Amino acid sequence: GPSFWLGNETLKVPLALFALNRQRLCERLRKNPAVQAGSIVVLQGGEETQRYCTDTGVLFRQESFFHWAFGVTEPGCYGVIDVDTGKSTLFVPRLPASHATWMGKIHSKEHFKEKYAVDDVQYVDEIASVLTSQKPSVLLTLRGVNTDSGSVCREASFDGISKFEVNNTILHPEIVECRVFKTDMELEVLRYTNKISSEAHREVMKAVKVGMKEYELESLFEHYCYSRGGMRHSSYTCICGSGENSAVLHYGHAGAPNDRTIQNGDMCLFDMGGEYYCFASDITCSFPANGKFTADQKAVYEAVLRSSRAVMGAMKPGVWWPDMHRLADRIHLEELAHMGILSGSVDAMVQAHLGAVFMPHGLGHFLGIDVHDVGGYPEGVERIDEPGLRSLRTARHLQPGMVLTVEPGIYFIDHLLDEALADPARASFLNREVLQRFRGFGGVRIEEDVVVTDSGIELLTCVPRTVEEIEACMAGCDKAFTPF
């Protein structure tokens, strides 16, 4: 069948991927005792947008649930699925003649049927009429709460929908649960996004020089991903934190826009991942700007390498993700004590939540069509109200087919350190005279993307990770990627 492809060495993604997702969704809905025979799933695609009140178009990127179900790149579409038969119908805009002048060929409905391998294609202005002629019992629409943003999913609507029986509660948990478990076809795309992003991270490590601005590496990363990988989008805004900025977790946004000069002696923490056909990657590499770890840098870095590999080595079905977070906390505390930053009983440190002073974020999260993917906190799964753990984006147990980031880190964050030093329950563990040397260090994060398998995990990411590997990579002479 047909495939999405951007030519050259980019990945061919079969449209069968999306057909399988539609089938899986129907199979799950059919087993839900509340779903009536004759139900039709109705999803609304994203629409084109502009900057504010201007005519400056924003590059269109499809809404994630719609993409998961249909793989459609064009704005202004709807898509429906007959639950009982699995039959799919795509609705596309009926375009004006002048589209041919300004925007390009006015493709036929048959072109879109062939392109997307759906059962039928109709025009958007006929959706009420087409759905009426199918005599559905109920329209199943999308509405629920994203547990990372707190936003409510936008429910499909169209002129005449008021004439139908509509249910907006059943679908969201079911399509979310389907998205949590990646098919082998989806895993092929995530292997690819990790491959290109890994290559781009290596090019960045080879290119970094003292004196460069952080954003020069952002630019290079995105150029590699687009020109070589066909990744027009990144999965999230690139985080290119040098020096003390490596302690800022989502550095790089408009308010802190990757605009620091990299200096000799800095650590770099680069968290970047290209997106291909709306599938994510999310990789973080940490390394010395000048290509040689100092003793202090090596110690912090290898502490995080230890937790990274201990967590990956422990992951397998049935493992409770909060236990992995706590494992990483304990290892960090052990290593920081070995370094002399901490003293005392690590058991007592753990009881006082000291780990969260150094790693205030979650160990990792589901990844898929969104970088912070859906389904981390379905009904019955509660957020743990403790330092560190409360920032976990899931408290689920691991099962095969889940895709997770594994991203421990250690940071030296002044307001968290100052709080701890003021608290007698934590201050006694902290050796101020040693810690003072690490003020302004920034931080280290090592982020891998992995798939849970029947027996353990599959690592998708492939970047240098030991101190020796990293130093060798940065010292490499290869003119394998040289823009102008």
Ligand X SMILES: CC(C)C[C@H](N)C(=O)O
* Element of type H or E holding 283: strand 283-288
Tell me the closest approach of the beta carbon of residue 405 to ligand X, in angstroms.
Answer: 7
Residue 291's closest CA among 211, 210, 198? 210
Quote the CA–CA distance of 44 and 47 in Å, as a whole number: 9
For residue 371, state whether it binds its own copies (rule: CB under 8 A). yes
Site for Na ion in 421-440 (CB under 5 A): none
Written as one letter, the residue type at 444 is V
- Work out the number of other CB atoms within 10 angstroms of the CB of residue 127: 21
Instruction: Please provide the distance, in angstroms rounded to a whole number, between the alpha carbons at the two ends of the chain.
Output: 39
Tell me the closest approach of the beta carbon of residue 325 to its own copies, in angstroms.
Answer: 17
- Closer residue to its own copies (CB): 224 or 270: 224
| Number of amino acids touching ligand OH (CB under 6 A) | 6
Tell me the closest approach of the beta carbon of residue 411 to ligand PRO, in angstroms.
Answer: 10
Site for ligand OH in 17-56 (CB under 6 A): none
Half-sphere exposure in the Cβ direction for 396 (13 Å, CA): 23
The answer on whether 203 is annotated among ligand-binding residues is no
Pick the binder of ligand OH from 21, 64, 198, 284 (CB under 6 A). 284
Half-sphere exposure in the Cβ direction for 87 (13 Å, CA): 13
10 Å CB burial of residue 432 (0-12, 13-18, 19+) is exposed
Tell me the closest approach of the beta carbon of residue 272 to ligand OH, in angstroms.
Answer: 9
Quote the CA–CA distance of 457 and 455 in Å, as a whole number: 7
Tell me the closest approach of the beta carbon of residue 449 to ligand X, in angstroms.
Answer: 10
The answer on whether 188 is annotated among ligand-binding residues is no
Tell me the closest approach of the beta carbon of residue 371 to ligand X, in angstroms.
Answer: 5
For residue 275, state whether it binds ligand OH (rule: CB under 6 A). no
Q: Classify the phi-psi angles of 258: left when phi > 0, otherwise alpha if psi is within -120 to 50, otherwise beta.
A: left
Q: 13 phi and psi, to 5 degrees?
A: -105, 115
For residue 371, state whether it binds ligand X (rule: CB under 6 A). yes
The answer on whether 372 is annotated among ligand-binding residues is yes
Quote the CA–CA distance of 112 and 393 in Å, as a whole number: 37
- The interface region with Na ion, picked from 91-99, 313-321, 361-369, 468-476 by CB under 5 A, is 468-476
The answer on whether 271 is annotated among ligand-binding residues is yes
The answer on whether 393 is annotated among ligand-binding residues is yes
Site string for its own copies, 143-172 (x = CB under 8 A): ---x-xx-xxxx------------------
Tally: H helices and E strands in the chain: 16, 18
148 touches, from ligand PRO, its own copies, ligand X, none (C-beta below 5 to 8 Å by class): its own copies
For residue 448, state whether it binds Mg ion (rule: CB under 5 A). no
For residue 271, state whether it binds ligand X (rule: CB under 6 A). yes
For residue 413, state whether it binds its own copies (rule: CB under 8 A). yes
Q: 351 phi and psi, to 5 degrees?
A: -65, -30
Binding residues for Mn(2+): 271, 282, 365, 407, 447
- Contacts with ligand OH by CB under 6 A lie at 271, 282, 284, 405, 407, 447
